[PDB]
Enzyme design. Structure first.
Site, PDB file in Angstrom:
ATOM      1  N   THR A  39       7.625   1.528  -6.866  1.00  0.00           N
ATOM      2  CA  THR A  39       6.597   1.197  -8.040  1.00  0.00           C
ATOM      3  C   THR A  39       6.724   2.695  -9.499  1.00  0.00           C
ATOM      4  O   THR A  39       6.395   3.709  -9.035  1.00  0.00           O
ATOM      5  CB  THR A  39       5.491   1.454  -7.757  1.00  0.00           C
ATOM      6  N   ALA A  85       0.334  -6.530  -5.555  1.00  0.00           N
ATOM      7  CA  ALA A  85       1.201  -7.563  -6.719  1.00  0.00           C
ATOM      8  C   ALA A  85      -0.048  -8.003  -6.665  1.00  0.00           C
ATOM      9  O   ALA A  85      -0.175  -9.269  -7.628  1.00  0.00           O
ATOM     10  CB  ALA A  85       2.044  -7.811  -5.950  1.00  0.00           C
TER      11      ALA A  85
END
Lengths: 196, 204, 232, 195, 212, 226, 222, 196, 195
Positions: E1, E49
């Protein structure tokens, strides 16, 4: 897995359930729990199967020395080795062992050695996990100084109730007869003793 | 991550016909930090090559430890150790400290100069001979490698076809391995000589 | 969160050319103590299906009323329904699946391992597993519990794949069921000698045999065996 | 300690060490070193847990010094680094583990080449031109690629190092309150005053 | 990320990585961590997510509804806050969140707000989210100027992803750019990190520990 | 893995599969699960592959040392007792499960030994993952007293059922037949239930289908004066 | 202690074509170290060219499947017998996972089919909600095994042109439905060999505009 | 604490030991475990004294409302009520309950309800912690359709054995005989029972 | 971490608050705002648990401003401070706690004085003219009172404040990046920048 030994006039007869269970899996169904540590001295094993075997072999190392140097061991003498081992190995081992034997001058003598290890002279004893299901029938139905037929019939029947009321008890009912005639093996098979 | 393989790394060993190859990625990681791009997994002693995967401190420690063990042998017998014999040597070093144990997955590769025969082996944490001569993979991409290798594997490729087959297996796997992704060095090993060829590939 | 209290152990079953055989030992086991004996596992639901239940005896009885009520419901709201819109295994099987899944998701499940075995209106053999978890699968041979592991590989010789159902006859299947029971009596400490065995047929109907015994119980090799391995 | 960096340039090695010594909720002292010479041209900085740091630095110091006297000749940085790695990797299997992580810079006077070796706590020797442990390496590694060139003068390495201090300061809660900047060259080891 | 966003004079540059990593196995190397809320507003997907894909869609729903009622665009401040309120209720249910809500509007100018799982609304100029957020700061800050061309701004935004993607374990994929105007975001494409890396090596003179 | 033993009149057979699994991934498709204690004692390993491998080796050297020392044939009986002792000492911190069987002059013997140090005798045993699947085959199909023939057929059948129902048991069956006063017969890959399926394309391509950056020679030998 | 979750195993594989899409999966069901079934499909046809596989623990995958199947019927009654697109279905399924994320499902769902341009598309899920359009995904336990091989032979990554020294990539090649069927097989063969929850059979659904095909291949029981 | 009930030709006799034990201290050594819930149906209690007490109150209340509304109930009807309270509340309350009553149209009957609640028809039942020890005694000296005196004596002997091998079994042996002639209560002092 | 300061002087209440907003192991933004107006004569600095701070501030802002419109006049500091204390008292008996401490510094226009309240994260209100929470009150309860005299002005209280900031900077391991200082008097609320 219920084991016993029961005195009578001409001796002591050991009894044992030949079922060995590790969980719900029967590890073996024809492994008897009768272990010779001397000619007239024999032992029954219940509890943790690994633990009891390891104690058992060391008692015989001592009693090998015992026969050779110090004359034969007594039923009492061997039972002390068990007590000593179980006690010092309190937290490594729980062994439920019944030691019994025939002497000439004293007849059959039975000592149960607890999990924690002590010694307790008794005219009849029962130990194990299969032994907590047959107490009330052992007390009532027993009598002292029996005849040989009667003593086998007492051992067979008590152990037959064990099988109805525990699952760790089964196989065949083993007996080792200790008398002045020798060491004699006896066996029954389930086809016979559930009709009781 | 897992305590035996925070710092990653991947090694892959195959057999060809009278040749071995072994290859590894060059990324060292420490958690999520990529630390060094140059840092080899594979080391060698004489004509036997060894990669050692795992927790990075123990790869370095056994590199040194094995050199000490091999060289004591070489000098004393006046001759090189063979990659058949060398297998059981890893197995004992790893098992000595079953309790508090080395955290590695070493993979041997090598070709005998007394049979001319490729030998590969794998070991776990406290060591085992895994004596397949199919192909042997270890590392954090262990799962990934066993499938990629299997798909490609035809036995008895020519050496230069074998270089195509192992480099490709390694490159796809690496992109999709979290704790390795940088660099590659491929050893194509033969009886006569040993050619070392670094790839050029993507960095993450 | 539940823990089982008294539990039944094992159900074994397999397909044949004209129906299915479902069988299981009769026993209510409270752990070490084999407390309750003759505890019927096989509840017939209608007469074209037998539903077998192992596991918690508490949820066994509870399901026993809900299945009887499933037929009582079928009679309801119609002029006929016991041969007109006749009952099928398929209805039971999914009824049970919905309920056990819902109860597991409320975090207080129905604790059973279930084998639904019957023959359909189409006559096609139906043999499917359902459990507390919510798992469903259909297989040529089934077994639950301990029998899943142990007795089933024996039944898998007799029928491997689903295209090998017509090569088994009623006699072949049953002989193998008895063999699977023999294995279970021996090497399960929570099996019992006693067992009930329902044979579901499409051309004959339900024959339900109660209280069979294991025969040919071998123990004559036991006299020969001595020691724990070494006899001094 | 609360910041530790290493950048290696054309002819020198540059190491930065935290001034602050954070102990519980109070900073007991705001101007202490966290680096000790190993040799006149080999410098070891340290960071990690308090108490481990201090006794470890001195113990390693005694050993490298003792070798230097024995052979009457100084060990090469390459040697030194493998010695310090060996102690950490042994400790991780011993009674008392350290959490001392080190960067050892040296101007190798036998290969006439600057070398920086990063060594972590668990015991991993890696040759690398960058280096840092804690959550200081997690800012400044990214930063370092762009603004670095294949080589630059020690003056340009000083300014480059000042840029990483500025990055850390902004984005990290930990106080260090300036840095000691020590350079390791061919002519000794010196301190440069830097903000 | 690795997500990072930074406002400048020409608009707002939103740069994200396209790798999702479960743990020691990599889930996808093609994902998108830009949610297109509506034509003006972008969100970012970092942390969980599932939570960022779903709730920012809901945000997009509210943007439309609010716009139908008033016949006027939903503001950047309003949108951000409504979503902060929304996730707050759902604090401690296992919700993870860390989106940067980016937009250029004609009454506020460019604005970036950070929206957190803990119910935070933080006005920024520069933000970053991920475990790889540490590394994203490094490049970005030191080469940041408020006065910056749009093209060079896109370029800075490629650079801020590469060093972070390199040194992070959970980042690769591709370098997914967007530039946000008052006419809303126009995509500035998907460029493999692989191919882009090499180029930057030669021209910048960066990446001297990498040999190929 | 699966391991069985079947006692018969003129000896004892020990069979075990070749596949070894360490996690859900298969470590080896072919690798031995019949380790040699002594020329007339063999045993197979189950559980954690490392613990079984190490133990067998450790005990094996001691029983070859013993043969020389007692100047007589190696007993199965010696081996078990010594092994049991060894197992005890760790206190069950070693994860070895074994079936040991052999022929010695006391005769054929077939033992099971556990990680704990529980010890068993039967005339049919199994241990491993796939032990429940084989155990079923033995109890039904076995009877007391068998020929060589029936014993070998019954042993391979049990492993074969093993493969088909047990996940960790796979690949081929290797069988070792120890008859009393005869050579052990190591029949590698006696039984295959399912041969390999091939891949449908050729995956071998030219070079330059994989990128190179540098090409080097690394040392492996000492140069002369040339 | 009751535990809700389990594991029932499997591996599934969707691959996106240029004009087709395929979704497959091995027919093995397991519990612990048993094999529950050796012939049970994981891949279900739901209509409008949408095939759905929900691999993992079945109790969660079957419940999810029943939810989507209800969705299509009310799509017909209220929206008057229109084509439920694979992209729109992906949203709809997301809300079904997300309808209880307090009590999260553990299945890896893959839907496969055509879009409304007729271009193969596979959209792939995470158990707690999210989806994204992939080109290739492996679900299930041997997903890790299968995947790098998919990028090599369908996406052509890490591959190069001869006679350049490997500095120019090997370019893309449009696929056939037969080409992918062969490649699919290979994946599940490799898995039989080197993973333990793959075998028994394989079920390949092929979703074309020439209908929905079933094709069966045995795998080994090793 | 042990409770049991034995069918006979004329009825059913309920037997109990009267000790209430919290931990291993005796609250009261005479508080009985046989509690009246209907005119011709009595119940037995084991597990936690508290949990079982409340459960009986609900049952008793239902069965009196059943006697007015829908005519008098049976042992079959009596059992099922306890079971639903036990089955729903199968973690909130811990209760082993024996339900034994007398009918003229079915005679004496015995249902036992285990801890989690399940319906069981048995001809005699045994529950408690002392019940375990005397299980094989009861199996053998139970007969169906036996004389009234041998029943008195068989229960008297089995509980006397429980006292002998369980430390929370004692007090007095109290008994409730359910017959068509009503209720007869009987009491037996250790001086009578224990010698035997 | 997250300093907030209060000192009451005889014509003003001078409240100060941090600009470090730290989410993670990384200060998320350098320079920020962290003190907001309830009313034109009441100002509320806040800190506490992460994320609870933004929600809580806005909520109290809305209650005071609502009430002020209903009365048609501005509410007294007494009335504001007991309102805030209530919300936290209610929260600690509820299932969502709010662990946010505030200082309320208003100027009363009915009595003609500054009133400074300290409201704890438990929810306890006690009036004190040197308030603070966190690890600010650990250095500053002592230091503010040292040079404190009964007769004071804005200017004397400001000198004394700036001095506090510097103490904290020295001995805390937390980079606050400076403070904003907002002064509250009968002439409104104004920001004056400070070091």
């Amino acid at each position: 897995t219920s084991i016993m030994a029961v005195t009578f006039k001409d001796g002591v007869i050991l009894g044992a359930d030949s079922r060995t269970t590790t969980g719900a899996y029967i590890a073996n169904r024809v492994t008897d729990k009768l272990t010779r540590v001397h000619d007239k001295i024999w032992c029954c094993r219940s509890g943790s199967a690994a633990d009891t075997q390891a104690i058992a072999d060391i008692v015989q190392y001592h009693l090998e020395l015992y026969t050779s140097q110090y004359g034969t061991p007594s039923t009492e003498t061997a039972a002390s080795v068990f007590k000593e081992l179980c006690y010092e190995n309190k937290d490594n081992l729980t062994a439920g062992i019944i030691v019994a034997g025939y002497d000439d001058k004293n007849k059959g003598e039975v000592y149960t050695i607890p999990l924690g290890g002590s010694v307790h002279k008794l005219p009849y004893a029962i130990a194990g996990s299969g032994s907590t299901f047959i107490y009330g029938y052992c007390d009532k139905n027993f009598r002292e100084n029996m005849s040989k037929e009667e003593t086998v019939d007492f051992i067979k029947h008590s152990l037959s109730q064990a099988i109805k009321w525990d699952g760790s008890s089964g196989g065949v009912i083993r007996m080792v007869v200790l008398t002045a005639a020798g060491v004699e093996r006896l066996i029954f098979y389930p086809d016979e003793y559930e009709q009781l | 991550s897992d305590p035996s393989s925070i710092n990653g790394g991947i090694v892959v060993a195959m057999t060809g016909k009278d040749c071995v190859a072994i290859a590894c990625d060059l990324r060292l990681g420490s958690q999520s930090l990529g630390v060094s791009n140059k840092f080899e997994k594979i080391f060698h002693y004489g004509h036997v090559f060894l990669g050692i995967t795992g927790l990075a401190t123990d790869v370095t420690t056994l590199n040194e430890m094995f050199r000490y063990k091999t060289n004591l042998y070489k000098l004393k017998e006046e001759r090189a150790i063979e990659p058949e014999t060398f297998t059981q040597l890893v197995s004992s070093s790893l098992y000595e400290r079953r309790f508090g144990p080395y955290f590695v997955g070493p993979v041997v590769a090598g070709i005998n100069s007394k049979s001319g025969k490729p030998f590969i082996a794998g070991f776990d944490l406290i060591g085992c001979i895994d004596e397949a001569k199919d192909f042997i993979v270890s590392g954090t991409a262990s799962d990934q490698l066993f499938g990629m290798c299997e798909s490609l594997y035809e036995p008895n490729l020519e050496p230069e076809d074998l270089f195509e087959t192992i480099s490709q297996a390694l490159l796809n796997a690496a992109d999709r391995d979290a704790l390795s992704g940088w660099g590659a060095v491929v050893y194509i090993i033969k009886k006569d000589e040993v050619v070392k060829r670094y790839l050029k590939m993507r960095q993450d | 969160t539940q823990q089982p209290i008294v539990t039944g152990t094992s159900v074994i079953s397999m397909k044949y050319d004209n129906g299915v055989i479902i069988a299981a030992d009769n026993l209510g086991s409270y752990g070490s103590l084999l407390r309750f004996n003759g505890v019927e596992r096989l509840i017939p639901v209608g007469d074209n299906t037998v539903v077998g239940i192992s596991g918690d005896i508490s949820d066994m009885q509870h399901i026993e009323r809900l299945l009887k009520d499933l037929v009582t419901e079928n009679a309801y709201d119609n002029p006929l329904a016991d041969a007109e819109e006749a009952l099928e295994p398929s209805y039971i099987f999914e009824y049970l699946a919905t309920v056990m899944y819902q109860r597991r998701s409320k975090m207080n499940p129905l604790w059973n391992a279930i084998i639904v075995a019957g023959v359909q209106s189409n006559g096609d053999q139906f043999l499917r597993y359902v459990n507390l978890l919510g798992v469903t699968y259909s297989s040529p041979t089934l077994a639950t519990g301990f029998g899943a592991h142990m007795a089933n590989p024996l039944l898998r010789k007799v029928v491997d794949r689903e295209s090998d159902i017509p090569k088994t006859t009623v006699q072949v299947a049953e002989e193998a069921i008895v063999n699977a029971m023999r294995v279970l009596y021996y090497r399960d400490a929570r099996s019992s000698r006693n067992f009930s065995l329902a044979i579901i047929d499409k051309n004959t109907g339900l024959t339900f045999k109660k209280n069979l015994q294991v025969e040919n119980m071998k123990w004559d090799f036991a006299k020969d065996i001595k020691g724990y391995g070494t006899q001094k | 300690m609360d910041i530790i960096l290493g950048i290696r340039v054309q002819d020198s090695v540059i190491l930065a060490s935290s001034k602050a010594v954070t102990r519980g909720i109070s900073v007991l002292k705001d101007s202490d070193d966290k680096t000790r010479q190993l040799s006149p041209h080999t410098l070891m900085s340290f960071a990690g847990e308090a108490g481990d740091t201090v006794q470890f630095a001195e113990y390693i110091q005694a050993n490298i010094q003792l070798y230097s006297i024995r052979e009457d000749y100084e060990l090469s940085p390459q040697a030194v680094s493998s010695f310090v790695r060996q102690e950490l990797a042994k400790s991780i299997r011993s009674r008392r583990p350290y959490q001392v992580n080190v960067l050892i810079g040296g101007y190798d006077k036998k290969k006439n080449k600057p070398e920086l070796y990063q060594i972590d706590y668990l015991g991993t020797k890696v040759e690398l031109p960058y280096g840092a442990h804690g959550y200081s390496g997690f800012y400044t590694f990214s930063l370092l690629d762009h603004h670095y060139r294949p080589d630059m003068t020690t003056e340009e390495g000083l300014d480059l190092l000042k840029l990483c201090v500025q990055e850390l300061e902004k984005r990290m809660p930990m106080d260090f309150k300036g840095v000691i900047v020590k350079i390791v060259d061919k002519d000794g080891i010196r301190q440069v005053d830097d903000f | 990320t690795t997500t990072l966003a930074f406002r400048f004079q020409g608009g707002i540059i939103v740069a994200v990585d396209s790798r999702a990593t479960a743990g020691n196995w990599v889930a996808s190397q093609t994902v998108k961590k830009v949610i297109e809320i509506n034509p003006f507003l972008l969100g970012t997907m970092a942390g969980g997510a599932a939570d960022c894909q779903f709730w920012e869609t809901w945000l997009g729903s509210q943007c439309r509804l609010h716009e139908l009622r008033e016949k006027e665009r939903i503001s950047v401040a309003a949108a951000s806050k409504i979503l902060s309120n929304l996730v707050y209720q759902y604090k401690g249910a296992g919700l993870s969140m860390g989106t940067m809500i980016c937009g250029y509007t004609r009454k506020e100018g460019p604005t970036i707000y950070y929206v957190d799982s803990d119910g935070t609304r933080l006005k920024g100029d520069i933000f970053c989210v991920g475990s790889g957020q540490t590394f994203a700061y490094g490049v970005l800050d030191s080469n940041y100027k408020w006065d910056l061309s749009v093209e060079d701004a896109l370029y800075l935004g490629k650079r801020s992803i590469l060093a972070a993607a390199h040194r992070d374990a959970y980042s690769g994929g591709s370098v997914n750019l967007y530039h946000v105007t008052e006419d809303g975001w126009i995509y500035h494409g998907n460029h493999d990190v692989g191919e882009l890396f090499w180029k930057v090596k030669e021209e910048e003179g960066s990446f001297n520990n990498v040999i190929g | 893995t699966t391991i069985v033993g079947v006692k018969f009149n003129n000896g004892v057979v020990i069979a075990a599969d070749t596949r070894s699994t360490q996690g859900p991934i298969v470590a080896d498709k072919n690798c031995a699960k019949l380790h040699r204690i002594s020329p007339k004692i063999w045993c197979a390993g189950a559980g954690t592959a490392a613990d079984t491998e190490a133990v067998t080796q450790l005990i094996g050297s001691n029983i070859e040392l013993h043969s020389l020392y007692t100047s007589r044939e190696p007993r199965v009986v010696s081996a078990l007792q010594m092994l049991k002792q060894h197992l005890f000492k760790y206190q069950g911190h070693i994860g070895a499960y074994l079936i040991v069987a052999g022929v010695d002059p006391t005769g054929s013997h077939l033992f099971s030994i556990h990680a704990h140090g529980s010890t068993d005798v039967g005339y049919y045993l199994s241990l491993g993952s796939g032990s429940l699947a084989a155990m079923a085959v033995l109890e039904s199909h076995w009877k007391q007293d068998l020929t060589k023939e029936e014993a070998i057929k019954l042993a391979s059948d049990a492993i074969q059922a093993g493969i088909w129902n047990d996940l960790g048991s796979g690949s081929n069956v290797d069988v070792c037949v120890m008859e009393i006063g005869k050579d052990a017969e190591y029949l590698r890959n006696y039984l295959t239930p399912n041969v390999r399926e091939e891949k449908q394309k050729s995956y071998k391509f030219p070079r330059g289908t994989t990128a190179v950056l540098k090409e080097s020679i690394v040392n492996i030998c000492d140069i002369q004066e040339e | 202690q009751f535990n809700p979750y389990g594991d029932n195993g499997g591996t599934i594989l969707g691959i996106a074509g240029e004009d087709f899409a395929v979704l497959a999966g091995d027919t093995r069901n397991i519990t612990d170290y048993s094999i529950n079934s050796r012939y049970e499909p994981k891949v279900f046809d739901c209509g409008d060219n949408i095939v759905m596989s929900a691999n993992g623990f079945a109790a969660d995958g079957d419940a999810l499947v029943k939810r989507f199947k209800n969705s299509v019927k009310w799509y017909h009654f209220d929206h008057n017998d229109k084509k439920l697109s694979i992209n729109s279905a992906a949203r709809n399924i997301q809300h079904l996972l997300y309808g209880k994320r307090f009590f999260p499902y553990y299945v890896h769902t893959i839907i496969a089919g055509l879009d409304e341009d007729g271009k193969g598309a596979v959209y792939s899920f995470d158990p707690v909600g999210s989806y994204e359009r992939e080109q290739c995904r492996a679900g299930g336990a041997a997903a890790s095994l299968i995947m790098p091989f998919l990028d090599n032979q369908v996406n052509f990554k890490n591959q190069y042109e001869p006679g350049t020294n490997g500095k120019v990539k090997k370019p893309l090649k449009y696929l056939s439905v037969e080409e992918v069927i062969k490649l699919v097989r290979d994946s599940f063969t490799s898995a039989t060999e080197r993973h333990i929850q793959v075998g028994d059979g394989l079920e390949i659904l092929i979703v074309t505009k020439d209908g929905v095909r079933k094709e069966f291949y045995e795998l080994k029981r090793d």
